[PDB]
Amino acid sequence: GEWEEIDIGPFTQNLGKFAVDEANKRGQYGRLTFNKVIRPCMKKTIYENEGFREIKGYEYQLYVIASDKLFRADISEDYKTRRRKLLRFDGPVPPP
Numbered sequence: 001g002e003w004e005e006i007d008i009g010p011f012t013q014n015l016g017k018f019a020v021d022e023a024n025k026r027g028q029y030g031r032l033t034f035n036k037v038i039r040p041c042m043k044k045t046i047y048e049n050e051g052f053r054e055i056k057g058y059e060y061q062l063y064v065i066a067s068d069k070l071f072r073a074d075i076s077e078d079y080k081t082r083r084r085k086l087l088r089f090d091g092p093v094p095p096p
Contacts, residue, residue, distance in 0.1 A: 003042040012041045016064035019073030022086035032066035040096055055079040063096050
């Protein structure tokens with residue numbers, strides 16, 4: 001389950017928007033206007049069982065610009081349901 005760099009196309013932008021949507025609901029970072037996900041976007045595969053390839057889900061690490069501030073968002077994504085959870089939302093963070 002190593003981290004892999006993915007693109008910052010619409011799918012990744014939609015992940016950043018999910019993160020900002022979730023940050024907004026949590027109310028710990030004020031009101032944020034999603035702008036964009038910038039590189040690098042990283043994805044890790046979570047396996048159901050060590051030694052087996054069945055995928056349990058993914059974790060993403062995103063650098064998201066919201067309200068002109070840079071945040072680092074970590075998002076989990078269940079493989080079967082594609083249900084996402086904002087695990088961590090930190091910042092403003094250093095440019096990557």
